[PDB]
Design a protein around this nucleic acid. Structure first.
Lengths: 100, 115, 100, 136, 82, 126
RNA sequence: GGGAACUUUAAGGAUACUGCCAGUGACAAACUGGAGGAAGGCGGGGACGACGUCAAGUCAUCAUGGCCCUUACGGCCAGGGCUACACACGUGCUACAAUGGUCGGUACAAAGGGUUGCUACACAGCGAUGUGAUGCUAAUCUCAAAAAGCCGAUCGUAGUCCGGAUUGGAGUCUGCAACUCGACUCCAUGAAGUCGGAAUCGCUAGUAAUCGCGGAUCAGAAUGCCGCGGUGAAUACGUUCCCG
């Protein structure tokens, strides 16, 4: 019943999807059964920034930053699974959390 | 009916009629009616003399008209005599609780005074 | 901002950092029911006897680059003028122009 | 609009009688999106007139609206068929408000009943309109 | 106003000066910038010179002043009319 | 037996249509218990009234999101789609009635510098 | 327990091109109408601002030529002020009520925030709130009650059971500290106001109107600003007139 739960967070959805696909392929190569990746709801933060140095209240730039989240479940892990997942390299811009 | 020296309306519900007395609001009216035992939807004109006396007994337990106006007058006069900041505002007929006076002080000031 | 104002904020931050533990202990003792009323009163006097700059309500968030005291955006630690410039040239990861 | 000519909006018939006249009258009665209150008022008025006289509400309303309907407005000008109904409903609305019944539905039912036989304030308004019209 | 569970607030230096005078009986005014301190029953019978922004205004503390802050008797703005 | 999904102003309705005697239930409630104003109930009932099949079907309906009007419109759309998924030849009549069209109008976003989507603050030359 | 159907979540794709049918323009560009389709002629909205104009705005975000001060025009501190008040103007909020006020019962959202934080639940208080305690680093727990809406009762046109300014008294919380100068709670008080002159403003559809919800700043302090959804209209004959 040793289930490995992997949570991925990123600011770039292409990066997060590539990382999730690589993780899933790495697990399937070893031969475990995997569930996902499952896309969690995205967080969107918005900001209103004045563009003029002194006085133009209606002249603003609107920015946003999104946080994408993926969930992966690994069940019936082979002994090689944990070692391969730990040996997997850390891609920049993606945060990976593993819970046993 | 005459209660506490004033003639409250007779054709209204008791809980609304009792608010015509100075110093008695809706909450106090409901308190008095509950303490006496009279329902709030009963009209004044359909109450008997014993119930009126019972209501008068409860009304006598709170400051209503002359005592309350006297107390408020003394409270303001004490500040004006002491000369604190609130007393000065009362003397000058200006807002007392920190509101702006550059604009919007007409309740305290009265109608606009042309220059 | 003037350099004196920045040094003033630095000094206040250092004082807040220095007096953090004693202030927390004093407030805990104040809020401690089991302590006697005399002990709570003494703790209140001790807390009132601390230097003013020990209190954190006198800290003002300033831009990490210029020291501007208006328009802070806690998330980036930069005032709006520097935030616009740094965002629009690509130095802030994940932030893009928002349209919806 | 200078160059472009815009088509007139098409509104759905009311769910109860499938009458666009009733729907448009309800739209005129409604304020700030309270279509439920407008429906209550209009349907109450129609039920009231129906119980007073056993006549189809749609037929009664259309006959009365035709009676109140002006061929000219107010300084005389000419009007088109749409403006005729618009002004008829407009004048019919106000007199019910100035009436004295306890609810708006009762007030409007009474106003319709009084305008159908010609002793209505909307009828008086139309009389003012046309006695103004013969001036030119 | 300040919570009753905390008690009245008096600045330590002003309280010490008042206590010293009351232990003694000296009648010289006590000069202070502490406009925010609350007037206590011990203050009664003393002259406190409260700063008002540019000057120290003398206040002779009577019984009716108890419960007020010291700054209420030293106004800070000057106005005579338009 | 047959299924339909209706959408109107952020409201989604799942409709399950089978053969029966006119039973109707929305979120484990009667139509009267769910919709207070009768126009919403009439909007819900339009599709079967136009087909004269009110007592020939049983409806199991769930709805989520939106308000009373939006939910009523979504239920009508779902009922129409479920009917079409049962009898394909029924679609022209419902299309003439106008029920198969998905109403795509939605709340317009507030815009920078305006009080609302279109409303603008009061202007003065002086 | 279970299922992978449906809603949804979120990545990748398909679809609309006058494509088909019927007339016109010119023998064109174009224009008119119809079927199918979720959508038909740019389907809706956002971002994106040509060559240039105004010695337009910013030396107080920042940088920078020149000029000026150097026991002071630099630096540190406590208190005060930026909150004043015979007046005038701009932008708003709340009302003048019955399509409403109050009371009782009962429905339906979207988006966003939460670890020096949000807090289930229990006890105490009329209440702001306090104490104990539980889950949550969150599609998991929480802010949270949506409100207008529907049903019933009452009020019956009164300056009122409308309105909620002002003032008296008593409190809670943040904060070293609410006098000048905070927010909120309770009792009492109950102002102007009965729809607003000359004139003037916004808006062409999920718009106007109306109803509630969230966030940035932030110890505390929004009727402002930036967003979110609910209910949901009226009218456009036309280019004389007014503006650019």
């Amino acid at each position: 019943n040793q289930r490995i739960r992997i949570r991925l967070k990123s600011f770039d959805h292409r990066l997060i999807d590539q990382s999730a696909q690589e993780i899933v392929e790495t697990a399937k190569r070893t031969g475990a059964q995997v569930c996902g990746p499952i896309p969690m709801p995205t967080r969107i933060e918005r900001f209103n920034v004045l563009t003029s140095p002194h006085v133009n209240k209606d002249a603003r730039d609107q920015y946003e930053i999104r946080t994408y989240k993926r969930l992966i479940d690994i069940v019936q892990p082979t002994d090689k699974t944990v070692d391969a997942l730990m040996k997997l390299d850390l891609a920049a811009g993606v945060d990976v959390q593993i819970a046993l | 009916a005459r209660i506490a020296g004033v003639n409250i309306p007779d054709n209204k519900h008791a809980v609304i009629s009792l608010t015509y007395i100075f110093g008695i609001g809706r909450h106090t009216a409901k308190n008095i009616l509950a303490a006496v035992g009279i329902t709030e939807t009963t009209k004044i004109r359909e109450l008997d003399d014993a119930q009126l006396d019972a209501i008068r007994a409860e009304v006598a337990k709170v400051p209503t008209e002359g005592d309350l106006r006297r107390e408020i007058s003394m409270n303001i006069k004490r500040l004006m005599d002491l000369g604190c900041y609130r007393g000065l505002r009362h003397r000058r007929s200006l807002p007392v609780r920190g509101q702006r006076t550059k604009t919007n002080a007409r309740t305290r000031k009265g109608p606009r005074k042309p220059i | 901002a003037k350099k004196g104002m920045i040094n003033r904020e630095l000094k206040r931050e250092k004082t807040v950092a220095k007096y953090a533990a004693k202030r927390a202990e004093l407030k805990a003792t104040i809020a401690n029911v089991n302590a006697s009323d005399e002990e709570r009163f003494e703790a209140m006097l001790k807390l009132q006897a601390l230097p003013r700059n020990a209190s954190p309500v006198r800290l003002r968030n300033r831009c990490g680059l210029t020291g501007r005291p208006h328009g802070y955006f806690r998330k980036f630690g930069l005032s709006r003028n520097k935030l616009r410039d740094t965002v629009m040239q690509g130095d802030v990861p994940g932030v893009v122009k928002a349209s919806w | 609009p200078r160059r472009r000519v815009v088509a007139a909006r098409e509104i759905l018939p009311d769910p109860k009688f499938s009458s666009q006249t009733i729907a448009k009258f309800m739209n005129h009665v409604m304020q700030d999106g309270k279509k439920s209150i407008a429906e209550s008022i209009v349907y109450g008025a129609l039920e009231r007139v129906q119980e007073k006289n056993k006549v189809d509400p749609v037929e009664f309303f259309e006959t009365t609206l035709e009676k109140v309907r002006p061929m000219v407005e107010v300084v005389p000008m000419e009007v088109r068929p749409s403006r005729r109904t618009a002004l008829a409903m407009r004048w019919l609305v106000d007199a019910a408000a100035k009436r004295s019944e306890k609810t708006m539905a009762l007030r409007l039912a009474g106003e319709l009943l009084d305008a159908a036989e010609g002793k209505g304030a909307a009828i008086k308004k139309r009389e003012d309109v046309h006695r103004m019209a013969e001036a030119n | 106003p300040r919570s009753l569970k905390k008690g009245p607030f008096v600045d330590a230096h002003l309280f010490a000066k008042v206590e010293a005078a009351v232990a003694s009986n000296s009648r010289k005014p006590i000069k202070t910038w502490s406009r925010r301190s609350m007037i206590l029953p011990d203050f009664v019978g003393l002259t406190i010179s409260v700063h008002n922004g540019r000057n120290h205004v003398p206040v002779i503390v009577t019984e009716h002043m108890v419960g007020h802050k010291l700054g209420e008797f030293a106004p800070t703005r000057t106005y005579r009319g338009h | 037996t047959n299924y339909g999904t209706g959408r109107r102003k952020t409201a989604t309705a799942r409709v399950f249509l089978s053969a029966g005697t006119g039973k109707l239930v929305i979120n484990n409630r009667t139509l009267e218990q769910y919709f207070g104003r009768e126009t919403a109930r009439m909007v819900v009932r339009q599709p079967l009234e136009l087909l004269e099949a009110t007592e020939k079907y049983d409806l199991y309906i769930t709805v989520k999101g939106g308000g009373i009007g939006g939910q009523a419109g979504a239920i009508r759309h779902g009922i129409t789609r479920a009917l079409i998924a049962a009898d394909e030849t029924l679609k022209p009549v419902l299309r003439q009635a106008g029920f198969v069209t998905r109403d795509a109008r939605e709340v317009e976003r507030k815009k920078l510098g305006l009080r609302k989507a279109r409303k603008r603050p009061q202007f003065s030359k002086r």
